[PDB]
């Protein structure tokens, strides 16, 4: 749950010379004292209980363990890691609304992928390198990177489709009946068709982008399920 995580750090005290048959450890109080405590600023103290543990199987073991339950104050990282990451992620969908004639789809999607990977590696440098659980922020960034790679592949496909002319490719009848008649209707496009083959190729490439813009908006919006669960 980084950066909204809560840590449970313990301090175990023992006498490394005498066992329970020689000295018995007792707790002066059930909690640690905060009478002269200086507030941290990054970490919020929640509870500092102390417990005296015996081993029913050993009878020579005694210790006192203090559980330090601390809660991270999350504004620093919510400002320096989450907002920049959400800002980067919001650009993952623009590539499908960018006209293919601008010749900048690759720049946009490649830059988005670069930024997401950089943020993922930074998060991998802030957290312990343990393989027990993955931060939800890291998982969400990982999912977004996979989506952006998929969008790069789709943009390459759409650019190939767009730069098609009747002198190099022939459009099959099924392509016509699907992409110029049926699919545009579902997406509320309604080709003006005021009147030539080259523009048909351009429109087909535009229909494919509009279709994937829908898919990347529902999935991206549904991506809040993988993000809103952290806070």
């Amino acid at each position, epitope marked *: 749950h980084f950066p909204f995580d809560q840590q449970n750090c313990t301090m175990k005290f023992r006498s490394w010379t005498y066992d329970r048959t020689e000295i018995d450890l007792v707790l002066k109080s059930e*909690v640690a004292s905060l009478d002269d*405590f200086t507030p941290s600023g990054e970490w919020d103290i929640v*509870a500092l209980p102390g417990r005296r543990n015996e081993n029913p199987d050993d009878s020579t073991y005694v210790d006192i363990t203090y559980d330090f*339950i601390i809660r991270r104050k999350p504004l620093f990282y919510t400002i320096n890691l989450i907002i920049p990451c959400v800002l980067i992620t919001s650009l993952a969908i623009l590539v499908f609304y960018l006209p293919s004639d601008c010749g900048e789809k690759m720049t946009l999607c490649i830059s988005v992928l670069l930024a997401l990977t950089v943020f993922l590696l930074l998060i991998s440098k802030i957290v312990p390198p343990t393989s027990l659980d993955v931060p939800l922020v890291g998982k969400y960034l990982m999912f977004t990177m996979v989506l952006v790679t998929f969008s790069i592949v789709t943009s390459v496909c759409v650019l190939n489709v767009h730069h098609r002319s009747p002198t190099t490719h022939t459009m099959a009848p099924w392509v016509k009946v699907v992409f110029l008649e049926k699919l545009p209707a579902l997406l509320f496009m309604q080709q003006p068709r005021h009147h030539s083959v080259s523009e048909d190729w351009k429109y087909v490439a535009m229909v494919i982008d509009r279709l994937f813009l829908w898919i990347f908006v529902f999935v991206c919006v549904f991506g809040t399920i993988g993000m809103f669960l952290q806070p």
Partner: antibody
Amino acid sequence: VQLQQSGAEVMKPGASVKISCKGTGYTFSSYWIEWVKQRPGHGLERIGEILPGSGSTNYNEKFRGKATFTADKSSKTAYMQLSSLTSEDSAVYYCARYLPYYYAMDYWGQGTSVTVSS
Amino acid sequence: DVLMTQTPLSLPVSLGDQASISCRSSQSIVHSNGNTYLEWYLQKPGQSPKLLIYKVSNRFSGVPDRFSGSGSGTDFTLKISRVEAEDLGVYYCFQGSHVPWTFGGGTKLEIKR
């Protein structure tokens, strides 16, 4: 262990009152102090909490801004200050000792009654 | 804030009868430690509340064994094997899992005759 609350209070509308909860017989600075409001009608509403050792404080959404917690360590006392007392604020307020995830609200103050009237 | 609801608002049950109290949460109040923190408080008229059960099932020291608790992610119930005169009062469910911590609606208890 004992939580001692201040006496009953009567205040005019729009004023501010400050009630206190004094804890003794335990590590006062290591236990959260929970403040609970009980209108004469019905219901228990938790106002918020303060850890005297530090300054950390939480408030329920309904009471954000209405109440403010301050704690004194030299004298084992915790204070809640209510601002802009209306007629709804008239109720009985309790102070309780709480350690999250380990010990429940096992000790409660006697209860302080606040009445808002002109 | 997690919203906690109690049913019934009033529970009339004569002496010696089984008493069932149900509390529900607007969200799951489970916690990573393997425990979900739920507590039950009883208030007599003109008195400060008293702790009865904590951590769903664990029973506070010095309380009659008739009281028992049980529940899951978002549904919990309190059981009283036998009802007595001292048992009269109001019962609240308290969740100690998600900040801020909220009380239940309260369920008054009465004896029918």
